Assembly symmetry: C2
Homo-oligomer: 257 residues x 2
């Protein structure tokens, strides 16, 4: 199976994904979110029994290929889509007065990427930016842990932090006064003393190093989650979730107070 | 592949093997140092025998009074996350009793209970958040994912050793202990988490002694736990579609308890 051997290396490495302009998505529910949100499904691989899976086959008019149970078990899925990777265009992320965004600086864990995508999506954020030497958004561990939120929350990989600022300066020029907000071990202020009712990009650092200093230079404010003591820290996705929850709380509350 | 080796290897599989031997593996200088610092007995220390041996490893080896064994480096590839951290040192650490009295209960009690977790990574992450945010213990209910699973241990980032984590088979033993705490003078409330909870998390009074119940990743809290809840709370969501990972939810709800406690702003 020649087509299959192309599909198996789509899981294995970033290099071949981005040469083919596609990636693998598993599960009836995530695939349905992909279709629902406009992402082209080039191929749709299926085992040759569930009600949802059957409904997908006669609603999604694309290349439909039946598969042996042996071959589908590679990581077990009943349906698997080959879904079109879209360009890394920062204007895919909508920016309005209530702008609420996340920037993940140089993440090493794809699991953390997908996880923050899920939290950003559930808690009302409008986009994610994966800046710098990163693990790939379209890694299977990221896709999986997004739990389909990849498809509703636009996640843009942007090599340089310079290209991010140019898109930030431009939203500023339009009227939305985005403010860059770093997280720190050395936090200026408690997260709950800061005003998340304003257009906000939230900068979150590597799991093992902090935010890069260069990201700290561009940061207008810095916030910290108050901790119990000396040798305690939060996983980046967990910390990002808590801060997003605080932003939601203030916006609903109409105040910090 | 000594008979001893195979016994240590077996500590990576089912929870029962660890339990009956009363031990589990802890990998990495940093986690082992934290086990030693918080008084977890170390039965054996395995180190790399074709010796790199950093300053840290050397320091553990001449300070930790225990059985010490040089191991071929490929036996130590034993457990890693293949092509992610081959351990230079591994400790065989004693498992403490699953006794709820290891969790201290004061007037401002904040505890977490994780109902039959599917993912050991989620357990360790919650242990880490609870530790960092001032909770006083975790209970893990059921015979699903294990606190002492290598992924949990690893996820906790050493917090396992400072945050008392106790396993119970089912809700009965937990309610026994809770009713005893309330007779002594701490009116602990059970607070479940759910999507469609009775009130938003920021409208709940988290200053009160609180046992927070986090449900399983796909099935949520069991019917037995919902029946036992005094209250139910939820994090408000943007749409009908998405949801939160259990550990992420737990972290946010623990943070909200911290927020209301320090100085006391709302609820």
């Amino acid at each position: 199976n020649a087509r299959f051997q192309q599909w198996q290396a789509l899981l294995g490495n970033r290099n071949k994904r981005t040469r083919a302009g596609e990636f693998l998505v598993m599960g009836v529910r995530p695939i349905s979110l992909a279709v629902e949100h406009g992402w082209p499904v080039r191929t749709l691989l299926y085992d040759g029994l569930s009600k949802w899976a059957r409904e997908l086959l006669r609603t999604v008019r694309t290349e439909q290929i039946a598969m042996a149970p042996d071959l589908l078990m590679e990581l077990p899925p009943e349906v698997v889509a080959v879904v079109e990777m879209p360009a890394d265009d920062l204007d895919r992320i909508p920016v309005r007065e209530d702008f609420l965004g996340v920037l993940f600086d140089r993440p090493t864990s794809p699991g953390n990427i997908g996880s923050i995508i899920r939290s950003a999506d559930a808690l009302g954020a409008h986009g994610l930016i994966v800046a710098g030497h990163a693990a790939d958004v379209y890694d299977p561990k990221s896709v999986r842990s997004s739990t389909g939120s990849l498809f509703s929350l636009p996640a843009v990989r942007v090599p340089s932090p310079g290209e991010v600022m140019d898109w930030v300066e431009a939203r500023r020029a339009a009227g939305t006064p985005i403010v860059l907000v770093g997280t720190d071990e050395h936090g200026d202020c408690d997260v709950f003393d800061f005003d998340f009712t304003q257009p906000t990009l939230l900068l979150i650092g590597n799991e093992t190093a902090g935010l890069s200093n260069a990201w700290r230079t561009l940061c207008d404010y810095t916030v910290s989650i108050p901790m119990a003591g000396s040798a305690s820290s939060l996983n980046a996705a967990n910390a990002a979730t808590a801060i997003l929850y605080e932003a939601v709380r203030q916006r609903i509350s109409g105040r910090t107070a």
